[PDB]
Design a protein around this ligand. Structure first.
Ligand SMILES: NC(=[NH2+])NCCC[C@H](N)C(=O)O
Ligand SMILES: [Mn+2]
Length: 342
């Protein structure tokens, strides 16, 4: 396949042998030079990817009245209309179904009113099964990647996985419309918020990523005064992520940039509308909602990122008018975050 990125195959199990350490070095190097790489999918990884894309296509054909009903005031899971999300003050144009951790009202965290905790408003049970199976496979890959990354930095194999038990993994199931006006913006420039972003796309094309740039200051999106949203949109360089069959892409999120002190950067990226609609799934391999990330290479440093606080801050800014956000504000659910930080 004519591709524009490096492609690696992951071992099923990462044990810490010499081959694993070598692979970790290569993944770190690819992120440091290109900001991204591809991982080869096996037949089951690919099958589950395609079944998820098919379920997304069927869901998006449903009437807006139905899609709009798939929302929750407890969790951000569920439907986002085209034009609803905001990035740096401007609307984004995909329709989205967000899948966060699927917690019923029987869950203790939901009973306690923790922000963002609640059940996915699945459109139907076939969609549910397809997305759950796909996300379980994506999670296995995320864990492999985190073990390899630790090994490549000469850290204990468990360094990042010790933050991801019951991790706050989630996924955006996206359909981008074709460009119809002179507007070609799909999503504005941004970074995502956790450890890794693992993504799949169809054959259409539209994702651009920004590699590391020597001498370029990068905002630390975990700080309220350094948002990465809306940065570098029109400025070179941007790498086109050529659609390639049988791969997922992988790039760092904000937590990986923080923990590595910028040795890895949270990859800025944006989406442009193409002449045809475009289906994609972006998966976020995240710390536990309660985990506090810390700098690995600066053990004098007292700075921390409480991951759940970062997620909640980000989703409130994405969806300022959503019923989920309104209920966080109404019930003072951010107070739970203050207690957890103790
Ligand atoms: N929920 C997301 N991950 N959204 C990604 C797009 C950027 C997001 N709207 C922001 O302002 O940070
Ligand atoms: Mn993104």
């Amino acid at each position: 396949h004519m591709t524009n990125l490096q492609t690696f195959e992951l071992p099923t199990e990462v044990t810490g042998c010499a081959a694993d350490i070598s692979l970790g070095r290569a993944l770190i190097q690819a992120w440091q030079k290109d900001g991204i790489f591809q991982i080869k999918t096996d037949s089951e990884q690919d099958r589950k990817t395609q079944e998820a894309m098919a379920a997304s296509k069927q869901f998006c054909k449903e009437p807006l009245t139905f899609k709009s009903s798939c929302v929750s005031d407890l969790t951000y899971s569920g439907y986002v209309a085209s034009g609803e999300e905001v990035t740096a003050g401007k609307p984004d144009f995909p329709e989205i179904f967000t899948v966060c951790k699927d917690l019923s009202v029987g869950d203790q965290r939901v009973k306690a009113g923790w922000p963002c905790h609640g059940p996915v408003p699945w459109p139907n049970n076939t969609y549910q099964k397809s997305m759950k199976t796909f996300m379980e496979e994506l999670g296995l890959a995320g864990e492999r990647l985190l073990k390899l990354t630790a090994l490549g930095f000469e850290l204990p194999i468990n360094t990042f996985t010790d933050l991801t038990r019951d991790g706050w993994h989630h996924m955006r199931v996206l359909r981008f419309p074709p460009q119809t006006s002179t507007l070609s913006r799909g999503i504005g420039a941004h970074t995502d918020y956790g450890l890794l972003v693992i993504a799949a796309q169809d054959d259409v094309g539209g994702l651009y990523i920004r590699p590391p740039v020597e001498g370029e200051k990068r905002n630390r999106n975990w700080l309220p005064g350094e948002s990465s949203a809306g940065m570098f949109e029109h400025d070179e360089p941007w790498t086109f992520v050529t659609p390639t069959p049988g791969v997922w892409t992988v790039f760092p999120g904000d937590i990986l940039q923080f923990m590595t002190g910028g040795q890895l950067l949270s990859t800025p990226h944006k989406v442009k509308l193409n002449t045809r609609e475009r289906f994609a799934c972006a998966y976020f391999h995240e710390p536990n909602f309660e985990a506090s990330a810390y700098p690995l290479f600066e053990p004098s440093a007292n700075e921390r990122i409480h991951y759940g606080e970062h997620f909640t801050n980000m989703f409130m800014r994405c969806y300022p008018d959503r019923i989920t956000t309104q209920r966080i504000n109404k019930e003072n659910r951010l107070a739970h975050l203050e207690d957890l930080k103790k």
